[PDB]
Amino acid sequence: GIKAYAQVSVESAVMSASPHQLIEMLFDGANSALVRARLFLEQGDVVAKGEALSKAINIIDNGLKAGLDQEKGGEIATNLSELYDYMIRRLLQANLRNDAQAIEEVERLLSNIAEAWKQISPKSDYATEVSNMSRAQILQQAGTSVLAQANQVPQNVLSLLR
Protein backbone atom coordinates (compact mmCIF):
# COMPACT_ATOMS: atom_id res chain seq x y z
CA GLY A 1 0.00 0.00 0.00
CA ILE A 2 2.37 2.70 1.22
CA LYS A 3 5.29 1.15 -0.66
CA ALA A 4 3.11 1.00 -3.79
CA TYR A 5 2.87 4.79 -4.08
CA ALA A 6 6.57 5.17 -3.27
CA GLN A 7 7.57 2.56 -5.87
CA VAL A 8 5.38 3.97 -8.65
CA SER A 9 6.50 7.54 -7.86
CA VAL A 10 10.07 6.61 -8.84
CA GLU A 11 9.82 3.65 -11.22
CA SER A 12 7.07 5.06 -13.44
CA ALA A 13 9.12 8.27 -13.76
CA VAL A 14 12.51 6.64 -14.41
CA MET A 15 11.33 4.15 -17.05
CA SER A 16 9.84 6.94 -19.20
CA ALA A 17 12.64 9.45 -18.55
CA SER A 18 14.87 10.69 -21.35
CA PRO A 19 18.62 11.09 -20.71
CA HIS A 20 17.81 14.73 -19.88
CA GLN A 21 14.92 13.81 -17.57
CA LEU A 22 17.09 11.33 -15.65
CA ILE A 23 19.30 14.25 -14.63
CA GLU A 24 16.27 16.33 -13.62
CA MET A 25 15.20 13.62 -11.17
CA LEU A 26 18.69 13.65 -9.64
CA PHE A 27 18.51 17.42 -9.09
CA ASP A 28 15.00 17.15 -7.62
CA GLY A 29 15.98 14.13 -5.54
CA ALA A 30 19.08 15.83 -4.15
CA ASN A 31 17.14 19.02 -3.42
CA SER A 32 14.52 17.25 -1.30
CA ALA A 33 17.26 15.48 0.66
CA LEU A 34 18.97 18.81 1.42
CA VAL A 35 15.70 20.33 2.64
CA ARG A 36 15.05 17.20 4.71
CA ALA A 37 18.54 17.37 6.23
CA ARG A 38 17.97 21.07 6.91
CA LEU A 39 14.59 20.52 8.59
CA PHE A 40 15.96 17.54 10.54
CA LEU A 41 18.85 19.66 11.82
CA GLU A 42 16.44 22.45 12.80
CA GLN A 43 14.51 19.97 14.98
CA GLY A 44 17.51 18.20 16.56
CA ASP A 45 17.32 14.83 14.79
CA VAL A 46 21.03 14.46 14.01
CA VAL A 47 20.55 10.80 13.06
CA ALA A 48 17.90 11.59 10.44
CA LYS A 49 19.97 14.60 9.34
CA GLY A 50 22.95 12.35 8.67
CA GLU A 51 20.77 9.91 6.74
CA ALA A 52 19.38 12.70 4.55
CA LEU A 53 22.81 14.21 3.87
CA SER A 54 24.23 10.79 2.97
CA LYS A 55 21.50 10.43 0.34
CA ALA A 56 22.25 13.91 -1.02
CA ILE A 57 25.99 13.18 -1.21
CA ASN A 58 25.26 9.84 -2.89
CA ILE A 59 23.12 11.53 -5.55
CA ILE A 60 25.68 14.26 -6.27
CA ASP A 61 28.71 11.95 -6.33
CA ASN A 62 27.39 8.65 -7.73
CA GLY A 63 24.77 10.30 -9.95
CA LEU A 64 25.39 13.84 -11.18
CA LYS A 65 29.20 13.67 -11.04
CA ALA A 66 29.28 10.02 -12.14
CA GLY A 67 27.29 10.97 -15.24
CA LEU A 68 29.85 13.55 -16.35
CA ASP A 69 31.68 12.88 -19.62
CA GLN A 70 35.11 14.49 -19.84
CA GLU A 71 35.79 14.02 -23.56
CA LYS A 72 32.33 14.76 -24.99
CA GLY A 73 31.62 17.42 -22.35
CA GLY A 74 34.81 19.46 -22.47
CA GLU A 75 34.71 22.60 -20.36
CA ILE A 76 31.12 22.07 -19.21
CA ALA A 77 31.89 18.70 -17.60
CA THR A 78 35.06 19.79 -15.78
CA ASN A 79 33.43 22.99 -14.52
CA LEU A 80 30.57 20.93 -13.08
CA SER A 81 33.02 18.40 -11.64
CA GLU A 82 34.86 21.09 -9.67
CA LEU A 83 31.46 22.51 -8.69
CA TYR A 84 30.24 19.05 -7.62
CA ASP A 85 33.40 18.45 -5.58
CA TYR A 86 32.68 21.65 -3.64
CA MET A 87 29.18 20.43 -2.73
CA ILE A 88 30.42 17.04 -1.50
CA ARG A 89 33.13 18.72 0.57
CA ARG A 90 30.61 21.19 2.03
CA LEU A 91 28.02 18.52 2.83
CA LEU A 92 30.62 16.40 4.63
CA GLN A 93 31.41 19.44 6.77
CA ALA A 94 27.68 20.08 7.22
CA ASN A 95 27.21 16.61 8.73
CA LEU A 96 30.38 16.72 10.84
CA ARG A 97 29.85 20.26 12.18
CA ASN A 98 26.01 20.27 12.15
CA ASP A 99 26.17 23.44 10.04
CA ALA A 100 22.82 24.45 8.55
CA GLN A 101 24.09 27.23 6.27
CA ALA A 102 26.45 24.74 4.62
CA ILE A 103 23.37 22.80 3.50
CA GLU A 104 21.67 26.00 2.35
CA GLU A 105 24.44 27.15 0.01
CA VAL A 106 24.67 23.68 -1.53
CA GLU A 107 20.88 23.78 -1.82
CA ARG A 108 21.30 27.17 -3.52
CA LEU A 109 24.15 26.13 -5.82
CA LEU A 110 22.24 23.04 -6.95
CA SER A 111 19.14 25.12 -7.69
CA ASN A 112 21.26 27.55 -9.71
CA ILE A 113 22.27 24.65 -11.98
CA ALA A 114 18.98 22.74 -11.96
CA GLU A 115 16.96 25.77 -13.07
CA ALA A 116 19.18 26.10 -16.14
CA TRP A 117 18.89 22.35 -16.77
CA LYS A 118 15.07 22.32 -16.68
CA GLN A 119 14.99 24.93 -19.47
CA ILE A 120 17.40 23.11 -21.80
CA SER A 121 15.08 20.27 -22.81
CA PRO A 122 16.12 18.66 -26.12
CA LYS A 123 14.42 19.63 -29.39
CA SER A 124 31.62 30.55 -1.10
CA ASP A 125 31.66 33.51 -3.48
CA TYR A 126 34.05 31.62 -5.77
CA ALA A 127 31.69 28.64 -5.91
CA THR A 128 28.80 30.94 -6.86
CA GLU A 129 30.70 32.20 -9.91
CA VAL A 130 31.61 28.61 -10.79
CA SER A 131 27.91 27.73 -10.81
CA ASN A 132 27.12 30.91 -12.76
CA MET A 133 29.65 29.92 -15.43
CA SER A 134 28.11 26.44 -15.60
CA ARG A 135 24.63 28.00 -15.70
CA ALA A 136 25.67 30.13 -18.68
CA GLN A 137 27.28 27.16 -20.44
CA ILE A 138 24.14 25.05 -20.04
CA LEU A 139 21.86 27.74 -21.47
CA GLN A 140 24.14 28.88 -24.30
CA GLN A 141 25.43 25.38 -25.20
CA ALA A 142 22.57 22.88 -25.20
CA GLY A 143 23.75 19.73 -26.98
CA THR A 144 27.28 19.81 -25.57
CA SER A 145 25.86 20.10 -22.04
CA VAL A 146 23.58 17.12 -22.72
CA LEU A 147 26.65 15.21 -23.91
CA ALA A 148 28.37 16.37 -20.71
CA GLN A 149 25.79 15.49 -18.05
CA ALA A 150 22.96 13.40 -19.56
CA ASN A 151 24.83 10.10 -19.43
CA GLN A 152 23.26 8.27 -16.46
CA VAL A 153 21.62 4.83 -16.61
CA PRO A 154 17.98 4.46 -15.46
CA GLN A 155 19.12 1.50 -13.33
CA ASN A 156 21.42 3.80 -11.35
CA VAL A 157 18.89 6.64 -11.02
CA LEU A 158 16.38 4.24 -9.46
CA SER A 159 18.72 2.91 -6.76
CA LEU A 160 19.86 6.44 -5.90
CA LEU A 161 16.27 7.67 -5.42
CA ARG A 162 14.51 4.51 -4.18
Binding site: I2, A4, Y5, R36
Partner: protein
Protein backbone atom coordinates in the same frame (compact mmCIF):
# COMPACT_ATOMS: atom_id res chain seq x y z
CA UNK B 1 -15.86 -0.56 -26.84
CA UNK B 2 -12.44 0.12 -25.32
CA UNK B 3 -10.79 -2.70 -23.38
CA UNK B 4 -8.81 -0.14 -21.34
CA UNK B 5 -10.12 3.41 -21.16
CA UNK B 6 -9.65 6.47 -18.99
CA UNK B 7 -11.91 9.54 -18.84
CA UNK B 8 -10.50 12.69 -17.24
CA UNK B 9 -11.77 16.18 -16.53
CA UNK B 10 -10.46 19.27 -18.25
CA UNK B 11 -8.06 20.03 -15.39
CA UNK B 12 -6.29 16.69 -16.04
CA UNK B 13 -5.77 17.35 -19.77
CA UNK B 14 -2.22 18.78 -19.34
CA UNK B 15 -1.15 15.53 -17.64
CA UNK B 16 -2.39 13.43 -20.58
CA UNK B 17 -1.36 15.81 -23.39
CA UNK B 18 1.92 14.98 -25.14
CA UNK B 19 2.21 18.56 -26.42
CA UNK B 20 2.10 19.92 -22.86
CA UNK B 21 3.82 18.51 -19.77
CA UNK B 22 2.17 15.08 -19.89
CA UNK B 23 3.54 13.53 -16.70
CA UNK B 24 0.64 11.09 -16.32
CA UNK B 25 0.95 9.98 -19.96
CA UNK B 26 4.56 8.89 -19.50
CA UNK B 27 3.79 7.05 -16.27
CA UNK B 28 1.08 4.94 -17.94
CA UNK B 29 3.56 3.85 -20.62
CA UNK B 30 6.05 2.88 -17.90
CA UNK B 31 3.43 0.81 -16.08
CA UNK B 32 2.50 -0.87 -19.36
CA UNK B 33 6.18 -1.62 -20.01
CA UNK B 34 6.66 -3.20 -16.57
CA UNK B 35 3.38 -5.04 -17.14
CA UNK B 36 4.88 -6.54 -20.31
CA UNK B 37 8.03 -7.40 -18.33
CA UNK B 38 6.49 -9.00 -15.24
CA UNK B 39 3.42 -10.83 -16.55
CA UNK B 40 4.91 -11.74 -19.94
CA UNK B 41 2.50 -10.23 -22.49
CA UNK B 42 1.74 -6.80 -23.94
CA UNK B 43 -1.52 -5.50 -22.43
CA UNK B 44 -3.95 -3.37 -24.45
CA UNK B 45 -3.37 0.37 -24.57
CA UNK B 46 -5.09 2.75 -22.15
CA UNK B 47 -7.20 4.92 -24.46
CA UNK B 48 -7.49 8.35 -22.82
CA UNK B 49 -10.51 10.52 -23.64
CA UNK B 50 -11.66 13.82 -22.16
CA UNK B 51 -15.11 14.00 -20.55
CA UNK B 52 -16.42 17.48 -19.76
CA UNK B 53 -19.33 16.01 -17.76
CA UNK B 54 -16.86 14.95 -15.05
CA UNK B 55 -15.45 17.25 -12.39
CA UNK B 56 -12.34 19.21 -13.43
CA UNK B 57 -9.89 17.15 -11.33
CA UNK B 58 -11.88 13.91 -11.71
CA UNK B 59 -10.70 10.80 -13.56
CA UNK B 60 -12.40 7.49 -14.35
CA UNK B 61 -10.71 4.21 -15.25
CA UNK B 62 -12.79 2.15 -17.68
CA UNK B 63 -12.63 -1.47 -18.83
CA UNK B 64 -14.95 -2.79 -21.56
CA UNK B 65 -17.05 0.30 -20.88
CA UNK B 66 -17.44 -0.64 -17.19
CA UNK B 67 -16.02 1.67 -14.53
CA UNK B 68 -13.45 -0.02 -12.29
CA UNK B 69 -11.96 3.00 -10.50
CA UNK B 70 -12.14 6.76 -9.96
CA UNK B 71 -10.87 9.51 -7.71
CA UNK B 72 -9.52 13.03 -7.45
CA UNK B 73 -6.18 14.33 -8.70
CA UNK B 74 -5.14 17.96 -8.26
CA UNK B 75 -2.18 18.78 -10.54
CA UNK B 76 -0.28 21.49 -8.67
CA UNK B 77 -0.77 19.80 -5.28
CA UNK B 78 1.03 16.89 -3.65
CA UNK B 79 -0.68 13.98 -1.90
CA UNK B 80 0.85 13.32 1.53
CA UNK B 81 -0.31 9.80 2.41
CA UNK B 82 -0.32 8.76 6.07
CA UNK B 83 0.89 5.18 6.71
CA UNK B 84 -0.87 5.35 10.10
CA UNK B 85 2.23 6.14 12.19
CA UNK B 86 2.94 9.69 10.98
CA UNK B 87 2.76 12.52 13.52
CA UNK B 88 2.02 16.22 13.18
CA UNK B 89 -0.74 18.05 11.34
CA UNK B 90 -0.72 19.29 7.74
CA UNK B 91 -2.84 22.09 6.22
CA UNK B 92 -4.66 21.23 3.02
CA UNK B 93 -7.51 19.13 1.66
CA UNK B 94 -8.04 16.00 3.74
CA UNK B 95 -9.04 13.02 1.61
CA UNK B 96 -8.45 9.29 1.07
CA UNK B 97 -6.15 7.71 -1.50
CA UNK B 98 -8.17 6.26 -4.41
CA UNK B 99 -6.13 3.08 -4.89
CA UNK B 100 -6.57 2.00 -1.26
CA UNK B 101 -8.06 3.49 1.90
CA UNK B 102 -5.20 5.24 3.66
CA UNK B 103 -5.63 8.71 5.11
CA UNK B 104 -4.09 11.38 2.87
CA UNK B 105 -4.18 15.13 2.28
CA UNK B 106 -3.46 17.38 -0.68
CA UNK B 107 -0.71 19.85 0.25
CA UNK B 108 1.22 22.57 -1.53
CA UNK B 109 4.60 21.80 -3.07
CA UNK B 110 6.37 23.89 -0.41
CA UNK B 111 5.24 21.44 2.30
CA UNK B 112 6.49 18.40 0.36
CA UNK B 113 9.68 17.91 2.38
CA UNK B 114 8.02 19.08 5.60
CA UNK B 115 5.45 16.30 5.19
CA UNK B 116 8.28 13.78 4.74
CA UNK B 117 9.84 15.01 8.00
CA UNK B 118 6.62 14.10 9.83
CA UNK B 119 6.51 10.65 8.23
CA UNK B 120 4.20 11.06 5.22
CA UNK B 121 4.56 9.38 1.83
CA UNK B 122 4.34 12.37 -0.52
CA UNK B 123 3.65 11.64 -4.20
CA UNK B 124 2.77 13.94 -7.07
CA UNK B 125 -0.65 14.10 -8.72
CA UNK B 126 0.25 11.97 -11.74
CA UNK B 127 1.55 9.26 -9.39
CA UNK B 128 -1.81 9.10 -7.58
CA UNK B 129 -3.57 8.12 -10.81
CA UNK B 130 -0.70 5.91 -12.01
CA UNK B 131 -0.69 3.96 -8.73
CA UNK B 132 -4.46 3.56 -8.96
CA UNK B 133 -4.18 2.34 -12.56
CA UNK B 134 -1.31 -0.03 -11.76
CA UNK B 135 -3.25 -1.45 -8.81
CA UNK B 136 -6.27 -2.10 -11.06
CA UNK B 137 -4.63 -3.64 -14.15
CA UNK B 138 -2.93 -6.14 -11.85
CA UNK B 139 -6.27 -7.34 -10.50
CA UNK B 140 -7.67 -7.67 -14.05
CA UNK B 141 -4.52 -9.09 -15.65
CA UNK B 142 -6.49 -12.12 -16.85
CA UNK B 143 -9.27 -10.04 -18.44
CA UNK B 144 -6.64 -8.04 -20.36
CA UNK B 145 -5.38 -11.25 -22.04
CA UNK B 146 -7.69 -11.75 -25.01
CA UNK B 147 -7.35 -13.98 -28.04
CA UNK B 148 -5.31 -11.36 -29.91
CA UNK B 149 -2.99 -10.98 -26.92
CA UNK B 150 -2.59 -14.76 -27.09
CA UNK B 151 -2.14 -14.78 -30.88
CA UNK B 152 0.59 -12.13 -30.85
CA UNK B 153 2.23 -13.97 -27.95
CA UNK B 154 2.07 -17.18 -29.99
CA UNK B 155 3.72 -15.40 -32.92
CA UNK B 156 6.42 -14.11 -30.56
CA UNK B 157 7.25 -17.60 -29.30
CA UNK B 158 7.04 -18.85 -32.89
CA UNK B 159 10.07 -16.68 -33.70
CA UNK B 160 11.95 -17.94 -30.62
CA UNK B 161 10.65 -21.55 -30.44
CA UNK B 162 9.93 -22.76 -33.98
CA UNK B 163 10.58 -26.43 -33.18
CA UNK B 164 8.08 -26.37 -30.29
CA UNK B 165 5.40 -24.18 -31.89
CA UNK B 166 5.37 -26.12 -35.18
CA UNK B 167 3.87 -29.37 -33.88
CA UNK B 168 2.05 -27.85 -30.89
CA UNK B 169 -0.44 -25.48 -32.56
CA UNK B 170 -2.99 -25.93 -33.90
CA UNK B 171 -2.69 -29.72 -34.01
CA UNK B 172 -1.97 -30.72 -30.42
CA UNK B 173 -3.34 -27.60 -28.68
CA UNK B 174 -5.76 -25.17 -30.29
CA UNK B 175 -5.41 -21.43 -29.78
CA UNK B 176 -8.67 -21.47 -27.81
CA UNK B 177 -7.29 -24.08 -25.41
CA UNK B 178 -3.89 -22.35 -25.29
CA UNK B 179 -5.58 -19.04 -24.45
CA UNK B 180 -7.80 -20.72 -21.85
CA UNK B 181 -4.82 -22.23 -20.01
CA UNK B 182 -2.67 -19.08 -20.02
CA UNK B 183 -5.60 -16.99 -18.77
CA UNK B 184 -6.12 -19.40 -15.86
CA UNK B 185 -2.52 -18.74 -14.80
CA UNK B 186 -3.02 -14.96 -15.00
CA UNK B 187 -6.27 -15.24 -13.03
CA UNK B 188 -4.33 -16.43 -9.95
CA UNK B 189 -1.27 -14.16 -10.19
CA UNK B 190 1.33 -16.41 -11.82
CA UNK B 191 3.16 -14.94 -14.85
CA UNK B 192 3.57 -16.62 -18.22
CA UNK B 193 7.12 -15.41 -18.82
CA UNK B 194 8.62 -18.92 -18.94
CA UNK B 195 7.13 -19.91 -22.27
CA UNK B 196 9.86 -22.56 -22.52
CA UNK B 197 8.21 -24.68 -19.81
CA UNK B 198 4.55 -23.89 -20.58
CA UNK B 199 4.68 -25.03 -24.21
CA UNK B 200 6.98 -27.92 -23.28
CA UNK B 201 4.56 -29.21 -20.63
CA UNK B 202 1.65 -28.94 -23.07
CA UNK B 203 3.64 -30.95 -25.62
CA UNK B 204 3.84 -33.73 -23.00
CA UNK B 205 0.30 -33.95 -21.57
CA UNK B 206 -2.08 -32.42 -24.12
CA UNK B 207 -1.91 -35.44 -26.49
CA UNK B 208 -3.36 -37.39 -23.53
CA UNK B 209 -5.46 -34.60 -21.97
CA UNK B 210 -8.05 -32.32 -23.57
CA UNK B 211 -9.50 -30.57 -20.51
CA UNK B 212 -7.98 -27.06 -20.29
CA UNK B 213 -8.46 -27.01 -16.51
CA UNK B 214 -6.55 -30.29 -16.20
CA UNK B 215 -3.84 -28.86 -18.45
CA UNK B 216 -3.70 -25.76 -16.23
CA UNK B 217 -2.99 -27.86 -13.13
CA UNK B 218 -0.23 -29.78 -14.93
CA UNK B 219 1.37 -26.63 -16.35
CA UNK B 220 1.16 -25.03 -12.91
CA UNK B 221 3.11 -27.79 -11.16
CA UNK B 222 5.79 -27.53 -13.85
CA UNK B 223 6.14 -23.84 -12.92
CA UNK B 224 6.23 -24.82 -9.25
CA UNK B 225 9.61 -23.35 -8.33
CA UNK B 226 8.70 -20.09 -10.06
CA UNK B 227 5.47 -19.79 -8.07
CA UNK B 228 7.37 -20.61 -4.87
CA UNK B 229 9.85 -17.79 -5.46
CA UNK B 230 7.30 -15.06 -6.25
CA UNK B 231 5.82 -15.57 -2.77
CA UNK B 232 8.95 -16.86 -0.95
CA UNK B 233 12.16 -15.39 -2.39
CA UNK B 234 15.50 -17.00 -1.64
CA UNK B 235 15.42 -19.76 0.96
CA UNK B 236 13.27 -18.02 3.57
CA UNK B 237 10.84 -19.63 6.02
CA UNK B 238 7.76 -20.73 4.06
CA UNK B 239 4.91 -19.33 6.18
CA UNK B 240 1.56 -20.52 4.79
CA UNK B 241 -1.94 -21.26 6.07
CA UNK B 242 -3.06 -24.86 6.34
CA UNK B 243 -6.37 -26.65 6.67
CA UNK B 244 -7.11 -28.91 9.61
CA UNK B 245 -6.42 -32.56 8.83
CA UNK B 246 -10.06 -33.15 9.74
CA UNK B 247 -11.34 -30.39 7.43
CA UNK B 248 -9.43 -31.89 4.50
CA UNK B 249 -11.49 -35.06 5.00
CA UNK B 250 -14.62 -32.88 4.80
CA UNK B 251 -13.82 -30.88 1.66
CA UNK B 252 -12.36 -33.91 -0.15
CA UNK B 253 -15.65 -35.70 0.48
CA UNK B 254 -17.78 -32.80 -0.75
CA UNK B 255 -15.52 -32.73 -3.82
CA UNK B 256 -16.23 -36.43 -4.43
CA UNK B 257 -24.42 -25.50 2.65
CA UNK B 258 -22.13 -24.37 5.45
CA UNK B 259 -19.79 -22.71 2.96
CA UNK B 260 -20.29 -19.47 4.90
CA UNK B 261 -18.55 -21.17 7.83
CA UNK B 262 -15.52 -21.79 5.61
CA UNK B 263 -15.50 -18.17 4.44
CA UNK B 264 -15.48 -16.83 8.00
CA UNK B 265 -12.54 -18.91 9.23
CA UNK B 266 -10.53 -18.24 6.07
CA UNK B 267 -10.83 -14.49 6.62
CA UNK B 268 -9.58 -14.82 10.20
CA UNK B 269 -6.56 -16.79 8.97
CA UNK B 270 -5.68 -13.98 6.56
CA UNK B 271 -5.83 -11.45 9.41
CA UNK B 272 -3.28 -13.36 11.51
CA UNK B 273 -1.00 -13.65 8.48
CA UNK B 274 -0.52 -9.87 8.65
CA UNK B 275 1.27 -10.49 11.94
CA UNK B 276 4.91 -11.64 11.52
CA UNK B 277 4.64 -10.63 7.84
CA UNK B 278 3.51 -13.74 5.97
CA UNK B 279 1.99 -13.89 2.48
CA UNK B 280 -1.75 -14.62 2.09
CA UNK B 281 -0.96 -18.07 0.71
CA UNK B 282 -3.20 -21.11 1.27
CA UNK B 283 -1.34 -24.42 1.02
CA UNK B 284 -3.73 -27.34 0.52
CA UNK B 285 -3.88 -30.83 -0.97
CA UNK B 286 -3.60 -31.10 -4.76
CA UNK B 287 -7.21 -32.32 -4.98
CA UNK B 288 -8.79 -29.44 -3.05
CA UNK B 289 -6.55 -26.79 -4.64
CA UNK B 290 -8.57 -25.97 -7.80
CA UNK B 291 -11.97 -26.14 -6.08
CA UNK B 292 -11.42 -23.86 -3.09
CA UNK B 293 -9.31 -21.52 -5.23
CA UNK B 294 -12.23 -20.61 -7.50
CA UNK B 295 -14.42 -20.42 -4.36
CA UNK B 296 -12.40 -18.48 -1.77
CA UNK B 297 -10.87 -16.03 -4.25
CA UNK B 298 -14.31 -14.85 -5.39
CA UNK B 299 -14.82 -12.89 -2.16
CA UNK B 300 -11.12 -12.94 -1.13
CA UNK B 301 -9.15 -12.06 -4.27
CA UNK B 302 -5.99 -11.35 -2.25
CA UNK B 303 -5.89 -14.99 -1.12
CA UNK B 304 -3.52 -17.26 -3.05
CA UNK B 305 -4.17 -21.02 -3.12
CA UNK B 306 -1.22 -23.38 -3.54
CA UNK B 307 -0.75 -27.13 -3.87
CA UNK B 308 1.69 -29.57 -2.29
CA UNK B 309 2.87 -30.69 -5.74
CA UNK B 310 3.86 -27.17 -6.85
CA UNK B 311 5.47 -25.96 -3.62
CA UNK B 312 9.17 -26.85 -3.64
CA UNK B 313 10.00 -29.79 -1.38
CA UNK B 314 13.59 -28.80 -0.53
CA UNK B 315 12.68 -25.68 1.43
CA UNK B 316 11.98 -24.58 5.00
CA UNK B 317 8.20 -25.03 5.17
CA UNK B 318 6.08 -24.19 8.21
CA UNK B 319 2.37 -23.66 8.78
CA UNK B 320 1.28 -20.39 10.40
CA UNK B 321 -2.53 -20.25 10.56
CA UNK B 322 -5.17 -22.98 10.72
CA UNK B 323 -8.69 -23.26 9.30
CA UNK B 324 -10.35 -25.67 11.71
Amino acid sequence: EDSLGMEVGYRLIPMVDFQQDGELLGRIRSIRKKFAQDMGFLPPVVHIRDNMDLQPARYRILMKGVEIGSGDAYPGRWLAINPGTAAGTLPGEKTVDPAFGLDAIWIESALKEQAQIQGFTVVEASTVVATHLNHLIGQFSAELFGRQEAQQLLDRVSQEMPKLTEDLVPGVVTLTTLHKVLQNLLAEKVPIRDMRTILETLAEHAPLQSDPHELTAVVRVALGRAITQQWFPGNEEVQVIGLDTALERLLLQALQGLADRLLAQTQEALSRQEMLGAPPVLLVNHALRPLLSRFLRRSLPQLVVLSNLELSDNRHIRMTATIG
